[PDB]
Amino acid sequence: KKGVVHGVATVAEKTKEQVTNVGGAVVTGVTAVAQKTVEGAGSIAAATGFVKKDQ
Amino acid sequence: KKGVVHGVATVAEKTKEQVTNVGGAVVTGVTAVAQKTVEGAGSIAAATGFVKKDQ
Amino acid sequence: KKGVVHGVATVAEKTKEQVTNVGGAVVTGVTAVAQKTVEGAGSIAAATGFVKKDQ
Amino acid sequence: KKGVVHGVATVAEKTKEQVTNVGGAVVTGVTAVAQKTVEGAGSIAAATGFVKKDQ
Amino acid sequence: KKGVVHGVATVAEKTKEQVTNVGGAVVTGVTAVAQKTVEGAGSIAAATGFVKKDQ
Amino acid sequence: KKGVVHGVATVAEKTKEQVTNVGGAVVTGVTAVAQKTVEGAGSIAAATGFVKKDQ
Amino acid sequence: KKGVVHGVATVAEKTKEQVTNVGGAVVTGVTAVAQKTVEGAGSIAAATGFVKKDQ
Amino acid sequence: KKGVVHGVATVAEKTKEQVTNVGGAVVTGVTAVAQKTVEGAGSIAAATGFVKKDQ
Amino acid sequence: KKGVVHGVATVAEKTKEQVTNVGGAVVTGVTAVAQKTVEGAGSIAAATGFVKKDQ
Amino acid sequence: KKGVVHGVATVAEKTKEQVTNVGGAVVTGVTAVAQKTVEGAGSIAAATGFVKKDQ
Ligand SMILES: Cc1ccc2nc(-c3ccc(N(C)C)cc3)sc2c1
Ligand SMILES: Cc1ccc2nc(-c3ccc(N(C)C)cc3)sc2c1
Ligand SMILES: Cc1ccc2nc(-c3ccc(N(C)C)cc3)sc2c1
Ligand SMILES: Cc1ccc2nc(-c3ccc(N(C)C)cc3)sc2c1
Ligand SMILES: Cc1ccc2nc(-c3ccc(N(C)C)cc3)sc2c1
Ligand SMILES: Cc1ccc2nc(-c3ccc(N(C)C)cc3)sc2c1
Ligand SMILES: Cc1ccc2nc(-c3ccc(N(C)C)cc3)sc2c1
Ligand SMILES: Cc1ccc2nc(-c3ccc(N(C)C)cc3)sc2c1
Ligand SMILES: Cc1ccc2nc(-c3ccc(N(C)C)cc3)sc2c1
Ligand SMILES: Cc1ccc2nc(-c3ccc(N(C)C)cc3)sc2c1
């Protein structure tokens, strides 16, 4: 076989899960957050996949 | 076989999971956060995958 | 076979898990955080994969 | 076979797990944090994979 | 076979686990932290893979 | 002061939390369950407070 | 002061939470269940406060 | 002071938490379960407070 | 002071935590379970407080 | 002072923690279990407080 990509690719066979991202956010997984009190200014309480590039 | 990529690629066969990211965040995995009190200014309480590049 | 990459690639066969990242965050694994009280200003309480490049 | 990379590559066969990172954070492994009280200003309580390059 | 890399590569065959990092953090291993009280300003309580290059 | 009980009592002052149970179940605490697949016949997957007295 | 109870009582002052139960079930606490697949015959998947006295 | 109990009592002053149980189950504490696959017939996967008296 | 009990009592002053149990299960403490695969028939995977009196 | 008990009592003053049990299970302490694969039929993987009296 032959393949040429510029990116971003994701090429496969017999594949149970696939995610391609440029951005941005993708949530595909099981996630449970239980929480009782959030205070403070300002605290990232429960972050799973996170990116902060403030300018 | 033959392959030429510029990146970012992810090329495979018979593959159960795949993630390609440029960014950005991707959450595909099981995650449970149980939490009772968050205070303080400002404290990253529970971070799993995290990136902070403030300017 | 033949392959030329610029990066970042991830090339394989018969492969159960794959992650490619430029960024950024990717969470694909099982993670359990149980927590009772977070205080202080400001304390990284429970960080699993973490990157802080403040300028 | 033949291969030329610029990096960062990860090239393989018959491979159970793969991670490629430039960044950034990737969490793919089992992780359990149980915690009862976090105080102080500011103390990295429980860090698994961590990078701090404040300027 | 023939291979020329610029780095950082990781080239292999028949390989159970692979990690390539430039950064940054990668957590792929089993990790259990149980903890009861963290105080002080500021004490790295339980660090597994850690890098601090504050300027 | 004077007190006579037959039970079950719970007598106090200045008390943040109280539970009295005869039974039966009482859930008053923070609880997070994240779960991806349960199989088998029959397996108690994730039990927190549990009592089984089958006859 | 004076008090005589037969039970079940719960007597207090300045008290943030109170539960009295004979039965029966009482749920007063924060609870998050995230779940993706339940199978099997028959498996208690995620039980928090539970009592089974089948005859 | 004077006190006579038959049981089960729980008598106190200045007391932050109290639980009285006859049964039965009481869950008042922080609890996080993250889980990815449960199989087998039949396996108690993650049990915190547990009692099995099958007859 | 004077006290006569039949049991089970728990009598105190200035007391931060109290548990009285006859049964039965009580969970009041911080608990984190992270888990990736449970198999076998039948294996107690992660048990914290546990009692099995099958007849 | 004077005290007569039948048992099981737990009598005190100025006392930070108290547990009385007849049973049964009580979990009041911090506990973290991180786990990646459990197999076999049937193996007690990670047991903290445990009692097995099968008949
Ligand atoms: C659409 C596509 C298909 C196939 C493909 N194969 C690539 C490849 C194969 C082998 C190697 N080596 C490094 C040997 C490199 C890239 S890139 C690519 C893109
Ligand atoms: C929105 C926001 C604001 C403030 C902030 N501060 C962070 C911080 C501060 C100090 C440290 N140390 C490592 C001492 C780590 C993170 S994360 C974060 C996110
Ligand atoms: C918003 C933004 C801007 C620029 C950018 N550049 C990226 C980049 C550049 C070069 C390479 N190489 C693989 C050399 C990879 C990613 S991701 C990305 C995202
Ligand atoms: C926002 C941003 C900007 C620039 C950037 N550059 C990247 C980079 C550059 C060179 C290489 N090599 C593999 C040499 C890899 C990544 S990632 C990235 C992300
Ligand atoms: C935001 C940013 C900027 C620049 C950058 N450069 C990277 C780099 C450069 C050279 C190499 N070599 C492999 C020589 C690897 C990575 S990662 C990266 C990320
Ligand atoms: C409605 C009520 C009020 C007060 C009260 N006090 C009780 C008590 C006080 C002290 C002791 N000791 C064991 C000293 C025992 C029971 S039972 C009871 C019932
Ligand atoms: C509705 C139901 C049916 C069956 C069942 N079986 C349970 C069980 C079986 C075996 C063991 N072992 C400790 C081997 C534990 C629990 S809990 C339960 C609940
Ligand atoms: C459905 C049911 C039946 C009987 C029962 N008996 C209880 C009992 C009996 C005696 C004592 N003592 C305190 C001696 C406590 C509880 S709870 C309960 C619930
Ligand atoms: C369903 C049931 C039946 C009987 C029962 N008996 C209990 C009992 C009996 C005696 C004492 N003493 C304190 C001696 C405590 C509990 S709890 C309970 C629950
Ligand atoms: C369902 C049941 C039946 C009987 C039972 N008896 C209990 C008992 C008996 C005596 C004492 N002593 C303190 C002597 C304590 C508990 S708990 C309990 C629970």
mmCIF file of C-alpha atoms in Angstrom, chain C residues 17-41:
data_model
loop_
_atom_site.group_PDB
_atom_site.id
_atom_site.type_symbol
_atom_site.label_atom_id
_atom_site.label_comp_id
_atom_site.label_asym_id
_atom_site.label_seq_id
_atom_site.Cartn_x
_atom_site.Cartn_y
_atom_site.Cartn_z
ATOM 1 C CA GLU C 17 -2.859 1.919 21.850
ATOM 2 C CA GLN C 18 -1.508 5.042 20.129
ATOM 3 C CA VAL C 19 -1.267 8.692 21.124
ATOM 4 C CA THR C 20 0.277 11.526 19.139
ATOM 5 C CA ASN C 21 0.397 14.922 20.723
ATOM 6 C CA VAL C 22 1.700 18.389 19.977
ATOM 7 C CA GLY C 23 0.255 20.874 22.421
ATOM 8 C CA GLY C 24 -1.692 20.307 24.511
ATOM 9 C CA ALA C 25 -3.180 17.441 26.487
ATOM 10 C CA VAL C 26 -4.366 13.895 25.853
ATOM 11 C CA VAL C 27 -5.990 11.746 28.533
ATOM 12 C CA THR C 28 -6.682 8.166 27.562
ATOM 13 C CA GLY C 29 -6.018 6.290 30.781
ATOM 14 C CA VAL C 30 -7.990 5.226 33.805
ATOM 15 C CA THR C 31 -7.847 7.855 36.519
ATOM 16 C CA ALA C 32 -9.511 8.117 39.908
ATOM 17 C CA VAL C 33 -9.158 11.118 42.165
ATOM 18 C CA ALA C 34 -10.885 11.190 45.517
ATOM 19 C CA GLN C 35 -10.355 14.293 47.535
ATOM 20 C CA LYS C 36 -11.742 15.904 50.661
ATOM 21 C CA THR C 37 -10.380 19.439 51.106
ATOM 22 C CA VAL C 38 -8.165 21.728 49.025
ATOM 23 C CA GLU C 39 -6.945 25.036 50.418
ATOM 24 C CA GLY C 40 -4.015 27.382 49.983
ATOM 25 C CA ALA C 41 -3.113 29.933 47.340
#
